[PDB]
């Protein structure tokens with residue numbers, strides 16, 4: 503599943519391009535329920551097998567999952583079949599970036615219904631995608647969680663309309679994307695940090711080959727004013743551990 | 749919407765029926781084999797066993813031989829997101845772009 507990625511074609515997540523000889527090489531299941539993984543422990547599910555515009559061994563993903571789960575174009579895209587999920591009942595009426603730029607109305611009939619072709623949003627309940635009719639730049643955070651896992655929803659039942667606008671600060675407040683490249687050249691000791699956190703990095707198997715873990719507890723030493731918040735948050739969203747800074 | 753079919757078959761005979769439906773389709777090793785993926789909307793179960801060059805009527809025969817639940821139930825398959833349906837059952841896979849495409853069991 504480790505393979506190169508295609509450039510952008512459209513601007514909709516409801517249409518996704520396709521590389522059919524690479525699916526002939528691999529084993530990927532049907533359509534709407536296919537998992538893609540990557541950075542910041544973010545599991546995401548959307549559609550594949552739909553457009554077939556580009557060539558083999560490179561597949562177009564949507565721009566909102568180009569900036570999320572990777573860093574830029576030309577990265578390594580991974581695929582995973584995640585089938586047989588249940589059916590949800592009318593996820594979000596609540597957008598989180600551009601409610602005040604326009605009119606509210608019915609708060610879900612206005613922007614979701616002209617911009618779909620029976621793609622009933624199998625996205626994480628709290629994940630983002632730009633969706634609007636005319637201006638086409640309204641994100642959302644999902645508050646309706648009728649299914650627990652990554653699931654599509656049933657066509658057009660009824661929910662409430664409690665959608666209120668918030669400033670778009672939540673993604674860089676709670677899931678701020680940092681990597682090895684996002685610290686300005688500390689690779690004299692960033693390599694040491696990566697060595698120390700590699701046994702915490704999803705690896706119980708080498709614990710019997712290590713005896714006790716040498717990270718019983720790690721102290722960061724630096725001058726007053728260099729800051730250590732993003733340095734300590736670097737292992738967050740690269741290991742996926744619960745951060746909970748105090 | 750329409751009535752569906754539940755798990756009325758035995759669990760020990762489903763793999764035997766899948767093997768019989770796989771052996772019903774002729775296998776040729778002189779062609780690049782295309783793995784046609786079918787997912788049914790009667791509970792989310794999905795199988796795949798096909799050859800390179802066949803027809804949509806052979807896909808219907810494979811669905812009939814796979815399980816006896818939807819053999820007599822009328823069903824129309826479709827591909828998601830061209831906003832189109834799957835007519836012309838005598839057409840081949842390459843002409844109507846059925847190369848490992850989306851097949852969704854839709855009940856009318």
Ligand SMILES: Nc1ncnc2c1ncn2[C@@H]1O[C@H](COP(=O)(O)OP(=O)(O)O)[C@@H](O)[C@H]1O
Pocket residue numbers: 684685686687688728729730731732733734
């Ligand atoms: N070595 C570094 N590499 C990149 N950015 C740094 C570095 N040191 C300080 N900064 C910048 O200093 C600012 C404030 O630092 P602070 O929030 O106290 O902790 P941190 O330095 O871990 O972010 C941040 O915006 C951060 O980008």
